[PDB]
Design a protein around this ligand. Structure first.
Ligand SMILES: C[C@H](Nc1nccc(Nc2cc(C3CC3)[nH]n2)n1)c1ccc2[nH]ccc2n1
Length: 285
């Protein structure tokens, strides 16, 4: 199997057990097994993750290695039947706990959006479509840092073929043009950011109480989802939302132009996120 040796060609040699010490488990679910650890020489804390389809793996590592960014969970090293991937450790945990257990004000939401847009602006400029933007794939630093991960469903595009048409991602966060198997581009990430902002407002994406297929159909025949309580939001927030969740892909904002939106100007410092992190940690204890 050529692929299996293409993977072994990527990862480096050396013994993992010898470079890091004090390993402690913190994750084991629909992925593999995630542990925490520390660098012996510098004292840096790291996160180390440990069939089916070993291609998502290859592209993950490859795409992560050549797309380093302050707003992306940094890939560090890799070792080898289960792969050992060493990554930047963010102690604040996932955005999901924050959106489901806490109320976020517009300044806090704007700050997260801005950090995410900056990640997206970087990826889209390097011809990378994430395709799986959701609060679950946003990690938080104990200092308030906001970073993106999960490049297992991404698509590297080119001027010759700048569109995809496959149904990938997570249903509730998928743009209509992805759901309808049309020719789509990087702006699908923008749609998904918009749905994530709806998470930050309401606690969950639209249609979450429905089954994934019903949600797929609902997205297909509703287009732009409605807020339960639009009146709660400022006019500038609602406008930012409308341009993320625009049906017309041409009218929908890019990461670049959305970064200039007046809504992001009311963003709080990322330190305003640490009380949300503490609340989420308390809430899920
Ligand atoms: C299983 C893990 N749970 C966790 N709990 C406390 C803190 C924490 N921080 C981390 C995780 C990492 C690298 C494994 C992505 N860096 N920092 N992660 C986790 C949580 C959410 C996720 N979204 C997409 C991957 C992923 N993984």
């Amino acid at each position: 199997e050529e692929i299996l040796e293409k993977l072994r060609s990527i990862v480096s040699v050396g013994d993992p057990k010898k470079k890091y010490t004090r390993f402690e488990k913190i994750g084991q679910g629909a992925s593999g097994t995630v542990y925490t650890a520390m660098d012996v020489a510098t004292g840096q804390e790291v996160a180390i993750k440990q069939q089916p389809k070993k291609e998502l793996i290859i592209n993950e590592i490859l795409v992560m290695r050549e797309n380093k960014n302050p707003n992306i969970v940094n890939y560090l090293d890799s070792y080898l039947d289960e792969l050992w991937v060493v990554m930047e450790y963010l102690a604040g945990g996932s955005l999901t706990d924050v959106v489901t257990e806490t109320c976020m004000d517009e300044g806090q939401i704007a700050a997260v959006c801005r950090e995410c847009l900056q990640a997206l602006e970087f990826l889209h400029s390097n011809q990378v479509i994430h395709r799986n933007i959701k609060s679950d794939n946003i990690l938080l630093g104990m200092d308030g840092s906001v970073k993106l991960t999960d490049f297992g469903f991404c698509a590297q595009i080119t001027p010759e073929q700048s569109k995809r048409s496959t149904m990938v991602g997570t249903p509730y966060w998928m743009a209509p043009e992805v759901v309808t198997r049309k020719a789509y581009g990087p702006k699908v990430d923008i749609w998904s950011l918009g749905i994530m902002a709806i998470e930050m407002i309401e606690g969950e994406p639209p249609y979450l109480n429905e089954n994934p297929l019903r949600a797929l159909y609902l997205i297909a025949t509703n287009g732009t989802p409605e807020l339960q309580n639009p009146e709660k939001l400022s006019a500038i927030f609602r406008d930012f939302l409308n341009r993320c969740l625009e049906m017309d892909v041409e009218k929908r904002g890019s990461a670049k132009e959305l970064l200039q939106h007046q809504f992001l100007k009311i963003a709080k410092p990322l330190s305003s996120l640490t009380p949300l992190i503490a609340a989420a940690k308390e809430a899920t204890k």
